[PDB]
């Protein structure tokens, strides 16, 4: 199970020998975009620290996962900085994740006060209140759920 995009799974990779042969034997790979490197020359460089971030997004959203973009998922859910030397892999996940009747277990943030700094996660479920009158925790006017 993958976590949703508002609280995205992060992992630091310790020292090892990194065979990228695997990670190629997975899928038809709807998006495979390295930025600071190239995938044909991936098995010769030796990076110090490796951060694997992982989540699920919708189908017409894969273009937003990029350095320097603006959208409803890149505003304050996952902001990729312009010093990006990683690689975005994104493949189609049907039948394992998309349960019939929908799958409401995933969700994403809609309203926020401030735009997110790059590489920042928040599980702030505070009821968003950008109106005159105080709402203080009820789902009414000038105070939605995020």
């Amino acid at each position, epitope marked *: 199970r993958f976590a949703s995009v508002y609280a995205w799974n992060r992992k630091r990779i310790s020292n090892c020998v990194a065979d990228y042969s695997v990670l190629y034997n997975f899928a038809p790979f709807f998006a495979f975009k390295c930025y600071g490197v190239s995938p044909t020359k991936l098995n010769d460089l030796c990076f110090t620290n490796v951060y694997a971030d992982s989540f699920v997004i919708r189908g017409n959203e894969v273009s937003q996962i990029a350095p320097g973009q603006t959208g409803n998922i890149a505003d304050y859910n996952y902001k990729l900085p312009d010093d990006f030397t990683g690689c975005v892999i994104a493949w189609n996940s049907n*039948k*394992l994740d*998309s*349960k*019939v*009747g929908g*799958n*409401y*277990n995933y*969700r994403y943030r809609l309203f926020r006060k401030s735009n997110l700094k790059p590489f920042e996660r928040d599980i702030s479920t505070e009821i968003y209140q950008a109106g005159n009158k105080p709402c203080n925790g009820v*789902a009414g006017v000038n105070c939605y*759920f995020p």
Partner: antibody
Amino acid sequence: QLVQSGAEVKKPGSSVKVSCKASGDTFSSYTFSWVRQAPGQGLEWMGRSIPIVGKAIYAQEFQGRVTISADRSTTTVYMELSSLRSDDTAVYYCARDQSGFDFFYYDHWGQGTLVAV
Amino acid sequence: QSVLTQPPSASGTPGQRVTISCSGSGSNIGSNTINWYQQLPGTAPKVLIYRNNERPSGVPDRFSGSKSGTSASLTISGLQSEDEAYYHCAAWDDSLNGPVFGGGTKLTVLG
């Protein structure tokens, strides 16, 4: 594990609260459907509820005269029915939607309340 | 009376295989699965079979479902003396965007 509220007779035109309470595992992950059964006859579908965002979703036959919500503070789901008649004197079942894949299958499935008028 | 028509009654000899079938519009019954439940009277019903072939755990083996096209059929080989019950079709449906059920045959095991 699910447990139900009481079963009792009401008067026509009233407003009726029924509540289902969960125990045994996590609560927010699952969703909850709500079905209705006329006595001696077959089921139908009345109202779906998602305890994650508080959204409710209904059927076009009986949209509006029932509201449905839940709270994960004590894992209780409240269904309020309005505009009762002699055609809703029925047994009402909350149910655990088995999310599965490709099938719905209606999981642990609980136990519901009779409603008479 | 709903979108998946169930034949109302069936009975006969015990200790024998029997079958019961469910067939409705191709909006759901020829496009999505047909699960099956069993209703014991005086109490809350159960589940019998999902995805037309696989039982869940705990339930016996002698029941078997089939999605033979638009005909969804339960076969009961070796009928026993405790499951006088109401057998109910079920299917997800994309038209009404919801599960839709059926009346359930009041299958009665004789003595």
